[PDB]
Amino acid sequence: MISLIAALAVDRVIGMENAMPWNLPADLAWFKRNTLNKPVIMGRHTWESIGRPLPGRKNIILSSQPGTDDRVTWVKSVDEAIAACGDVPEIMVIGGGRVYEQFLPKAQKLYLTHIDAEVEGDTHFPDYEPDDWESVFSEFHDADAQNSHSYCFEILERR
Ligand SMILES: NC(=O)c1ccc[n+]([C@@H]2O[C@H](COP(=O)([O-])OP(=O)(O)OC[C@H]3O[C@@H](n4cnc5c(N)ncnc54)[C@H](OP(=O)(O)O)[C@@H]3O)[C@@H](O)[C@H]2O)c1
Ligand SMILES: Nc1nc(=O)c2nc(CNc3ccc(C(=O)N[C@@H](CCC(=O)O)C(=O)O)cc3)cnc2[nH]1
Numbered sequence: 001m002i003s004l005i006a007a008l009a010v011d012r013v014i015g016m017e018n019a020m021p022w023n024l025p026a027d028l029a030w031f032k033r034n035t036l037n038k039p040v041i042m043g044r045h046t047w048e049s050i051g052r053p054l055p056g057r058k059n060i061i062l063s064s065q066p067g068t069d070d071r072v073t074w075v076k077s078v079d080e081a082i083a084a085c086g087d088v089p090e091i092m093v094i095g096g097g098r099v100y101e102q103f104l105p106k107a108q109k110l111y112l113t114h115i116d117a118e119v120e121g122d123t124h125f126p127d128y129e130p131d132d133w134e135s136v137f138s139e140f141h142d143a144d145a146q147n148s149h150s151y152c153f154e155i156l157e158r159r
């Protein structure tokens with residue numbers, strides 16, 4: 001089972017200049033809760049952006065080039081990435097835009113954070129067919145002293 005997890009600002013913006021230009025500790029905490037103890041697949045630019053392994057998860061990096069860090073697993077295709085996860089119940093695809101596009105056809109489940117923020121982007125989440133997906137969980141949070149936008153956790157499952 002393949003799932004995508006991502007946080008989307010207005011217009012599906014997910015990144016700018018190889019970062020997320022927001023700061024929402026509560027969303028990072030949701031990301032960790034939903035990924036811990038599962039393998040995470042990411043593209044090389046997202047690997048660079050995070051800048052270090054995510055602990056407690058098997059980190060699998062897609063790149064056409066040989067790997068440059070043996071603390072993580074490097075693979076050269078979608079199918080190799082999936083195989084490197086092994087017999088696991090749930091594989092978490094953690095981006096970025098190019099990787100999300102490739103895994104979205106195989107995915108059964110999306111974990112999307114909808115952030116009420118206007119930010120210029122150079123990377124987007126795929127323009128996914130909404131009719132394909134059932135919303136099974138929604139949880140809205142107002143901004144607070146730690147989280148300077150409102151945000152909504154959503155889980156969708158392919159119908
Ligand atoms: N808001 C969020 O939830 C979120 C999540 C993740 C990332 N982001 C943001 O998204 C941006 C990065 O996304 P991006 O689209 O630029 O890059 P990306 O998808 O992270 O990485 C693309 C790279 O991955 C490799 N790759 C992808 N598919 C491959 C395949 N099938 N076979 C082999 N290699 C493959 C290639 O590396 P090579 O060039 O080495 O071949 C490619 O250049 C950053 O701004 C980041 O902060 C945001
Ligand atoms: N919902 C969601 N939010 C994100 O920020 C996000 N980020 C990525 C990729 N980038 C990142 C960047 C940093 C960390 C990170 O530092 N997470 C730590 C923090 C734990 C804590 O803040 O609570 C982790 O252990 O997961 C994870 C992913 C992919 N999907 C996402 N999905």
Ligand SMILES: [Mn+2]
Pocket residue numbers: 116117118148149150
């Ligand atoms: Mn806002």
Ligand SMILES: [Mn+2]
Pocket residue numbers: 135154
């Ligand atoms: Mn919805």
